[PDB]
Design an enzyme around this catalytic site. Structure first.
Site, mmCIF file in Angstrom:
data_model
loop_
_atom_site.group_PDB
_atom_site.id
_atom_site.type_symbol
_atom_site.label_atom_id
_atom_site.label_comp_id
_atom_site.label_asym_id
_atom_site.label_seq_id
_atom_site.Cartn_x
_atom_site.Cartn_y
_atom_site.Cartn_z
ATOM 1 N N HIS A 291 -0.784 -12.444 -2.725
ATOM 2 C CA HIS A 291 -1.834 -13.312 -2.187
ATOM 3 C C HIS A 291 -1.329 -14.724 -1.980
ATOM 4 C CE1 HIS A 291 -5.096 -10.060 -2.950
ATOM 5 N NE2 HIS A 291 -4.128 -9.680 -2.087
ATOM 6 N N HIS B 254 0.785 -1.177 0.000
ATOM 7 C CA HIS B 254 0.000 0.000 0.000
ATOM 8 C C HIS B 254 0.833 1.248 0.000
ATOM 9 C CE1 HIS B 254 -4.125 -1.728 1.271
ATOM 10 N NE2 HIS B 254 -3.515 -2.519 0.408
HETATM 11 C C1 HEM Z 1 -6.373 -6.215 -7.459
HETATM 12 C C2 HEM Z 1 -5.446 -5.861 -6.668
HETATM 13 C C3 HEM Z 1 -5.557 -6.173 -5.261
HETATM 14 C C4 HEM Z 1 -6.683 -6.335 -4.440
HETATM 15 C C5 HEM Z 1 -8.132 -5.953 -4.775
HETATM 16 C C6 HEM Z 1 -6.289 -6.595 -3.105
HETATM 17 C C7 HEM Z 1 -7.139 -6.775 -1.979
HETATM 18 C C8 HEM Z 1 -6.741 -7.056 -0.675
HETATM 19 C C9 HEM Z 1 -7.644 -7.168 0.412
HETATM 20 C C10 HEM Z 1 -9.116 -6.760 0.396
HETATM 21 C C11 HEM Z 1 -6.914 -7.575 1.512
HETATM 22 C C12 HEM Z 1 -7.412 -7.792 2.887
HETATM 23 C C13 HEM Z 1 -7.178 -6.632 3.898
HETATM 24 C C14 HEM Z 1 -7.559 -7.208 5.227
HETATM 25 O O1 HEM Z 1 -8.828 -7.429 5.405
HETATM 26 O O2 HEM Z 1 -6.684 -7.425 6.127
HETATM 27 C C15 HEM Z 1 -5.583 -7.791 1.020
HETATM 28 C C16 HEM Z 1 -4.583 -8.404 1.707
HETATM 29 C C17 HEM Z 1 -3.301 -8.662 1.335
HETATM 30 N N1 HEM Z 1 -2.828 -8.240 0.069
HETATM 31 FE FE1 HEM Z 1 -3.883 -7.700 -1.516
HETATM 32 N N2 HEM Z 1 -4.985 -6.950 -3.125
HETATM 33 C C18 HEM Z 1 -4.438 -6.575 -4.339
HETATM 34 C C19 HEM Z 1 -3.099 -6.630 -4.676
HETATM 35 C C20 HEM Z 1 -2.081 -6.927 -3.803
HETATM 36 C C21 HEM Z 1 -0.678 -6.836 -4.183
HETATM 37 C C22 HEM Z 1 -0.155 -6.223 -5.434
HETATM 38 C C23 HEM Z 1 0.063 -7.276 -3.108
HETATM 39 C C24 HEM Z 1 1.539 -7.394 -3.028
HETATM 40 C C25 HEM Z 1 2.430 -7.722 -3.974
HETATM 41 C C26 HEM Z 1 -0.867 -7.630 -2.056
HETATM 42 C C27 HEM Z 1 -0.585 -8.231 -0.914
HETATM 43 C C28 HEM Z 1 -1.475 -8.575 0.138
HETATM 44 C C29 HEM Z 1 -1.076 -9.298 1.376
HETATM 45 C C30 HEM Z 1 0.212 -9.897 1.598
HETATM 46 C C31 HEM Z 1 -2.219 -9.347 2.111
HETATM 47 C C32 HEM Z 1 -2.431 -9.998 3.400
HETATM 48 C C33 HEM Z 1 -2.401 -9.092 4.595
HETATM 49 C C34 HEM Z 1 -2.309 -9.760 5.932
HETATM 50 O O3 HEM Z 1 -1.864 -11.021 5.971
HETATM 51 O O4 HEM Z 1 -2.581 -9.122 7.031
HETATM 52 N N3 HEM Z 1 -2.142 -7.514 -2.573
HETATM 53 N N4 HEM Z 1 -5.602 -7.664 -0.410
#
Ligand code: HEM
Ligand code: HEM
Ligand SMILES: [Cl-]
Ligand SMILES: [Cl-]
Ligand code: NA
Ligand code: NA
Lengths: 713, 713
Positions: A244, A77
Site C-alpha cells: 500500500h 494475488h
Molecule cells: C489485508 C490485506 C490486504 C487487503 C484487504 C488489501 C486490499 C486491496 C484492495 C481492496 C485494493 C484495491 C483493488 C482495486 O480497487 O484496484 C488493493 C490494491 C493494492 N494492493 Fe492490497 N490489500 C491487502 C494486502 C496487500 C499486499 C500484501 C500487497 C503486496 C505486498 C498489496 C498490494 C496492493 C497494491 C500495490 C495495490 C494497488 C493496485 C493498483 O495500483 O492498481 N496489498 N488492496
C-alpha cells in the site's frame, strides 16, 4: 447433459488424480522448462518489463502513467491464494490465468494486467513461464519504483488446466458468513483448509469483517488469514504497508456498472471481463473493488509515506462513490496526486484494513517501529515479499537463475550440502544386508521409510524423506509415526550407520536420510523374497541430514498426517469420509488411481498400518509382498456389514457359515465398492497378476521415496 | 465443494478430450490387448462359461436352474446402448461396469450377472477383457440352451473410466415425455443423438409409450429406437422374438421394496445394488423390472414357442404383482413352468412390446413368416445377434480369434483385400510431383483429404479415408464436401491414377483411396514450401477402394458432418453452441485439446474452409503453412464484436482506427476466449513456435490420415 456427478453427487471423485496428463500438455514429453529458463536472457526480459511499466495502453490506461501498482497487486494475488494447511494455491503454477481464479472478484481487472504482459510472453515464449513472469513482473515493478528486492528465482513450470482445490462450499460469490454453507463456526473459527474470509477473496474483506468497518475486528481476520498463509505479525505488517505504499484502489462509480467476470463474459471479450458501463469504463473511471483510496503522495515511488500518513492523521469513516466503507484524513490538505488530472489533488485515504495496522495493539508496535525505522521496514518487506512469492516453490534446489538469494532461510526447510563421496551400488547392497541382519522386521522397515517419505506434498513441494526430519521434533512425536516404535528403529539404524561410516576411507559416508530410505528398500526386497520373488528396489543416494536448529517446528505442523489411509490412520473423526481423505492424500503424493491402489494393497500386507491394526490386513502371510489384499477383498464368498460399535468398521464373514474372516475400514472397502477403483482392484486381483503387482508396487514405492529429489531433476 | 462447473455451468468442457490417459489406465503403456487375447485359451473359457450356466449361487439363485436368460439380457443390454447418430454406446468398451450404465434402471440386477462372471475374469485375467467376456457369455448362454450362433470376435479392449456420452438432459430417472428437459417434441420426434425413449432405458418402455399399454403405438417407438441402433424391421423382430424365447422377467412384489442402485448403495454392498426387502429379495421373490412374464414352455431351451404363443392366443390386459401393465393369454391352460416350484405352472404372458410384433402391420407380416418358417427365424436371429454385438467394433481387421465369421457383411463397411504390390517411396515422390504439376491447389488437396479422412469416429470405428468412399454416394454429395469442387479434384486424381497404373509392371497399382491421402500430403508439403520450410509428411500406403455395392447409403448418412468446426462449417442452426460441437467432433476424431488447436489453426490458413469462407482465415499468406492464425487471433490490437445481422459472426477491427481486419465465427474465437484454449493458442502464437507449430501440425494431420488403418495395427 445430465452427468454422473448430477446423479450421485456424493460419489468420490477420482478425476483429481488424472489431471496434468500428457494429453492436455501442449509441450512435448521431453520438454524441460528448467533447461529453457536457464538459457533465457533474464536481463533482457527485465529491461522489456521496465519499459512496459510506463507504456500506457489506451484500452486500460496506466494510473499516474505507471503500471507498477497494478503489477504488484497482480503478483501479490498470484501468491496470495496459498494455504499452509494443504499447500494448495500460491503462484507456483500460474493458476491465476485459469478458472476459477481468473474470475474471482478479488482478481478483477488483473485480466487486464496479464493481457499487458502478452507481448513479452510472446517474445520469449517457452523460456519464461506465465507463472514465473507474473512474479518477475511484480519484482521489476518494485525495482522500477526504487525498491530493492531480496532476489528472484525462476523455475515455476506452467500448467495447462485448473487445479482441483477446495475453496469453500458457498454457491454465491462473496457470501457473508453465517449462510447455509458458512465457512465459519464457533467463535469466528475459519474451517480448515481455507485461508480467506469469503468466497472469492484473497484474504480479508477490505471494508472489515462481513463488511463491518471496525479496524480492530478486521485485524483479527488479517492475523488469522495471514497465519494460514504462513506469515507472522511482522511479515503481515511489512507486506500490507509495503504494498500500500504503491498505487491506488478503483471505485469511481457504482459496482452495478461492472459486467460479467471473464469465465461468464461473451466470446467477443476474448478472455477479459468486468467490462464497465461507467463513463469511459477505465482509467479515471475505473471500478475494480469499489473502493477509492490512494495511500501515498508518490504512488509510483517507494517511500515511508504510508506510515507517515497512517500515524500523522486521524481518520473519518466515509463512503466511496460505489458506496463502500473507507476512511479519510480529518482536516488534511489535498496532498495526494490524482491518477490522470495533474491539476487535482486529494486528501489522504485508508482502508479499514490499513487502520488495523495502527489500532490492533500488537500491529501498532510493529508499525511504529517501522515508521521510526524505515530501513527496518524496507528489509522486512523485501524478505516477506520473497517469502510470499516463493513459499510454494519447494526446496532451493529447484530455484533457477542468476538472482537467487544466497541466504538460506529457515522457512525453506533447508537441507545441507553434501560435500563427500556417495555410496555406490555395492555399498547399498552391503547396507541392505546389514539392515536385514539387525533383526528389524519388514513391517518396521516399511513403516519407517513410509513415515519419512510420505510427508511430501506436491502442492507446495514441502516434506519428503530428505533431511531425515523424522528423527527431529516434531515429526518424531507424531502419533501416526508411532513414536516409541520409531525411536527403536532409528536407534538401530543409527548404529549401522555409525559402524559403516567409521569403516570407510576417503571421506565416503551415508546419511541417516539415505539409510532410512535404503532400509525401507531392504524391507520391500525382503517381503518380495518372503513371497518367493527376487526383486531389486531402486535406490538413489544423496539425501542429507538437517539439524533441529535448521527446522522450524511450528511450520512443520501442517505437514502432520492426521489422516493417512495408506496406514489406515485417522487421528480423529472428520466430516469428510475417510475415502475422500485417501484420494486427497494420494493427490498430494502425486499418485494416479492405479498407483494409489497398488500402493495401498501392498502396504496393507507389509504391516504398515499404525498400531498394527488388522483392518484391511487381508492375508495369512503378513510381511510377504503378494496381491492377497485384492484377491481376498474381491472374493464374493465373503459378506460385509458395518459393526454395531462403529459404522465405519466392517466385518467380513463367510457368506455360508458366518465365520469372521476379516475386518476393514471405509478406506479398505472402497476398493470393492467404487466402480472405478474396483475395476483397478480386479486387475491386481487376477490370477495372472502376481508379477505385475510386485513390479508396479516397487515402482510406486520408489516414486514415493524420490518425491523430494529435485537434486536429481 | 463448489466447482468451476457450478459457477459457469455452460462453459465448454475440454476434460472429454483427455479421458483415457495413461494416468487412469492400470496397464502398462505398451500393453497390447490383441496380443493377449490371441494367446487366450478361448475353448477353456467357453467350457468354464458352460459350467457356470447351471452353478447357482445362493445370493442370486438361477431361474429354472440356468442363468442363460439373465446372461443373454446382460449381453443384449451391453450392446443395446449403441446409437448410430454418433456411434457412442454399445458393447465395445465394457462400459456397463461403470457409471451411469451400471446403475440405470433398465440394467437392474445385471450387477449380479457381472459378479457371477468375476471368477472367470479373475482366472483368465488380462487375456480376456470384460467387454469381450460379457458378449462371449451371452453367446455361450445361447449355445448352452440349444441355439447355434453365427460366430464371435474378440478384441474389445477394456476401458477404465466412464465415457463422456450425452444420454439426455432429464434430471429424473425414467421421466415421461413432455417435461422441462423432454427428449421428445412435435409428433413424437426423438432428439438426436438419443436412441431411447426415457432416461435410463435401453430402447423402449415395456409397458408401452409413456406407460400407455397400446401395442400399436409401442411398435412405433420400437421401430424408431431400433432404427437409431442400426436395425431394420426384420432384424428387430428377429431380435425381440429370439431374446424372449428365453428366460423371464421379475416382478414378484411392489417396486418400493427395491433399494438403492449400485452407485448409491452403501460401501458394504461391495458394488451391488437394488437390494430388495420383498420376501427373500431374490430367486422366486426377485424384482427387476416389475413385470412378471415368462414367454415360453421351455425357458431354458431354444424353441419355436414364442410365435406359437403370440399368434395362438388372444391377449388380455392385466397387472403384474408390482402394479405394471402386461398381458395374459385368454382361456389358456397353465402350461408355462415356474422358475423355482415344480408344482406351479402359469398361463402364457406377454409384454405390450411383444404384442407389437403381432399388432403393428409390418411386423405382423415378418412375425408370421417367422412362425411359418422357423429356420428363417433362427437364421435371422443368429445374424442379428452377431450384428447387435459387433456393430461398434469397426472394420473386420479388428476382429480376433478362431470364431470370426468368414462371411462379409454390408454393415461392416467392407474394404476389399489388397492383392498387389504397393507403391514405395520413389513412387510416392513421383505421384506427389504429378499431383503438384496438375495445377491442383493446396486448398483443394488439403480440403479433399480432410473430407475423406475426417469421417472417422472412434466411438464405433466407422469412417475414415480407407475405401475411397468419398467418391461414392452419399459422401460425394454432402454439402460439407463441396460436391462440385470435389468432383473436379477427383477427376484430376483419377486421371493421375490411371496414367500411373497403366505404366506399371507386375501387378503394382495405387488405389484412389491412397492417392487422395497422398495428394493431401503433397498439399501440406507444398504449403510448407510456400512458408519457406522443408518438411516431410509421412504416408503409409495400403488403402483399397470399396464399391458402391459395398457401401450402404442409408447407414452412411449418419456419418455426414453437419457441423465441422475444422472446416468452419455448420449446416444449420442447432441448439448446442458451435464450439461445443467442435469439441464433440474432436472427441470422435480422438484428438486431445492441443491436437484440436494445432489442427484447426493450420487448416484455416491452408484453405480448408467450406466455400472458401474467410471466417478465421487470419493470414495474408493463405496456402502457406504458418502459425499466423494464432499470432493474429491473439493480437490485442484487434477488437471483436458480433455483427448486427448475425450474433454468431464476429468482426475484428483495429482498436485505434476502427478499420475491419478480419471476420470469425464462434469456433474461431473460442481459441481466444476459453481460458484453457487460449493458453494453448499462446504456445503456438509465440515467437519461438513456428517450427513447433509445423511439426505438430504434420503429426496431427498424419494421425487423422491413419485413424482407420487397423491393417497397420
Ligand atoms: C489485508 C490485506 C490486504 C487487503 C484487504 C488489501 C486490499 C486491496 C484492495 C481492496 C485494493 C484495491 C483493488 C482495486 O480497487 O484496484 C488493493 C490494491 C493494492 N494492493 Fe492490497 N490489500 C491487502 C494486502 C496487500 C499486499 C500484501 C500487497 C503486496 C505486498 C498489496 C498490494 C496492493 C497494491 C500495490 C495495490 C494497488 C493496485 C493498483 O495500483 O492498481 N496489498 N488492496
Ligand atoms: C422392444 C425391445 C425389448 C424390450 C422392451 C424388452 C424388455 C425386457 C424386460 C422388461 C425384461 C425383464 C427384466 C426383468 O424384469 O428381469 C426383459 C428380459 C429379457 N430380454 Fe428383453 N426386451 C427387449 C428386447 C430384447 C432383446 C433384443 C433381447 C435379446 C436378443 C432380449 C432378451 C431378453 C431376455 C433373454 C430376457 C430375460 C432375462 C432373464 O431371464 O433374467 N430382449 N426384456
Ligand atoms: Cl493449486
Ligand atoms: Cl460410449
Ligand atoms: Na500450491
Ligand atoms: Na461406441
Amino acid at each position: 447433459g445430465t452427468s454422473n456427478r448430477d446423479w450421485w453427487p456424493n460419489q468420490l471423485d477420482l478425476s483429481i488424480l488424472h489431471r496434468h496428463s500428457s494429453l492436455s500438455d501442449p509441450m512435448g514429453k521431453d520438454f524441460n522448462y528448467a533447461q529453457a529458463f536457464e538459457k533465457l536472457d533474464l536481463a533482457a526480459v527485465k529491461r522489456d518489463l521496465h519499459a512496459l511499466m510506463t507504456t500506457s495502453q489506451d484500452w486500460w490506461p496506466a494510473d499516474f502513467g505507471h503500471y507498477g501498482g497494478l503489477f504488484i497487486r497482480m503478483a501479490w494475488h498470484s501468491a496470495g491464494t496459498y494455504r499452509t494447511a494443504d499447500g494448495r494455491g500460491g503462484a507456483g503454477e500460474g493458476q491465476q490465468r485459469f478458472a476459477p481464479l481468473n474470475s474471482w472478484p478479488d482478481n478483477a481487472n488483473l485480466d487486464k494486467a496479464r493481457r499487458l504482459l502478452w507481448p513479452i510472453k510472446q517474445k520469449y515464449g517457452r523460456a519464461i513461464s506465465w507463472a514465473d513472469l507474473l512474479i518477475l513482473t511484480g519484482n521489476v515493478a518494485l525495482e522500477s519504483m526504487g525498491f530493492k528486492t531480496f532476489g528472484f528465482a525462476g523455475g515455476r513450470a506452467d500448467t495447462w488446466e485448473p487445479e482441483d482445490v477446495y475453496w469453500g462450499s458457498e454457491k454465491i460469490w462473496l457470501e457473508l458468513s453465517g449462510g447455509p454453507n458458512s465457512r465459519y463456526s464457533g467463535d469466528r473459527q475459519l474451517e480448515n483448509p481455507l485461508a480467506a474470509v469469503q468466497m472469492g477473496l484473497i484474504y480479508v474483506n477490505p471494508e472489515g469483517p462481513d463488511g463491518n468497518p471496525d479496524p480492530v475486528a478486521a485485524a483479527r481476520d488479517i492475523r488469522d488469514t495471514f497465519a494460514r498463509m504462513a506469515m507472522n505479525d511482522e511479515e503481515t505488517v511489512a507486506l500490507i504497508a509495503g504494498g500500500h505504499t504503491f498505487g491506488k484502489t478503483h471505485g469511481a462509480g457504482p459496482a452495478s456498472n461492472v459486467g460479467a467476470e471473464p469465465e461468464a463474459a461473451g466470446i467477443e471479450a476474448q478472455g477479459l471481463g468486468w467490462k464497465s458501463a461507467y463513463r469511459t469504463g477505465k482509467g479515471a473511471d475505473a471500478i475494480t473493488s469499489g473502493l477509492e483510496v490512494t495511500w501515498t503522495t508518490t504512488p509510483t515511488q517507494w517511500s515511508h509515506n504510508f506510515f507517515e500518513n497512517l500515524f500523522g492523521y486521524e481518520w473519518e469513516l466515509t463512503k466511496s462513490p460505489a458506496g463502500d466503507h473507507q476512511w479519510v484524513a480529518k482536516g488534511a490538505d489535498a496532498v495526494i496526486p490524482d491518477a490522470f488530472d495533474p491539476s487535482k489533488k486529494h486528501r489522504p485515504t485508508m482502508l479499514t484494513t490499513d487502520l488495523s495496522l495502527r489500532f490492533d495493539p500488537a500491529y501498532e508496535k510493529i508499525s511504529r517501529r517501522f515508521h521510526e525505522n524505515p530501513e527496518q521496514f524496507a528489509d522486512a518487506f523485501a524478505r516477506a515479499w520473497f517469502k510470499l512469492t516463493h513459499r510454494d516453490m519447494g526446496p532451493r534446489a529447484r530455484y533457477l537463475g542468476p538472482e537467487v538469494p544466497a541466504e538460506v532461510l529457515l522457512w525453506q526447510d533447508p537441507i545441507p550440502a553434501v560435500d563427500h563421496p556417495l555410496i555406490d551400488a555395492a555399498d547399498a547392497a552391503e547396507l541392505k544386508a546389514k539392515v536385514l541382519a539387525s533383526g528389524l522386521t519388514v513391517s518396521q522397515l516399511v513403516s519407517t521409510a513410509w513415515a519419512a517419505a510420505s510427508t511430501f506434498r506436491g502442492s507446495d513441494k514441502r516434506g519428503g524423506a530428505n533431511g531425515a526430519r523424522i528423527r527431529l521434533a516434531p515429526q518424531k512425536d507424531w502419533e501416526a509415526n508411532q513414536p516409541e516404535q520409531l525411536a527403536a528403529v532409528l536407534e538401530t539404524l543409527e548404529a549401522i550407520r555409525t559402524a559403516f561410516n567409521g569403516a570407510q576411507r576417503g571421506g565416503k559416508q551415508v546419511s541417516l536420510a539415505d539409510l532410512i530410505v535404503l532400509a525401507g528398500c531392504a524391507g520391500v526386497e525382503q517381503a518380495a523374497k518372503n513371497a518367493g520373488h527376487a526383486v531389486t528396489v531402486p535406490f538413489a543416494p544423496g539425501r542429507a541430514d538437517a539439524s533441529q536448529e535448521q527446522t522450524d517446528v511450528e511450520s512443520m505442523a501442517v505437514l502432520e498426517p492426521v489422516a493417512d489411509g495408506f496406514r489406515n490412520y485417522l487421528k480423529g473423526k472428520y466430516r469428510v469420509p475417510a475415502e475422500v481423505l485417501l484420494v486427497d492424500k494420494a493427490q498430494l503424493l502425486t499418485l494416479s488411481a492405479p498407483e494409489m491402489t497398488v500402493l495401498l494393497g501392498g502396504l496393507r500386507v507389509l504391516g504398515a498400518n499404525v498400531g498394527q491394526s488388522r483392518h484391511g490386513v487381508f492375508t495369512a502371510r503378513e510381511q510377504a509382498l503378494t496381491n492377497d489384499f485384492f484377491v481376498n477383498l474381491l472374493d464374493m464368498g465373503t459378506e460385509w456389514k458395518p459393526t454395531a460399535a462403529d459404522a465405519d468398521v466392517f466385518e467380513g464373514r463367510d457368506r455360508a457359515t458366518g465365520e469372521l474372516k476379516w475386518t476393514g475400514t471405509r478406506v479398505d472397502l472402497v476398493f470393492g465398492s467404487h466402480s472405478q477403483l474396483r475395476a483397478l482392484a480386479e486387475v491386481y486381483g487376477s490370477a495372472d497378476a502376481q508379477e505385475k503387482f510386485v513390479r508396479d508396487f516397487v515402482a510406486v514405492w520408489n516414486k514415493v521415496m524420490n518425491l523430494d529429489r529435485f537434486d536429481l531433476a
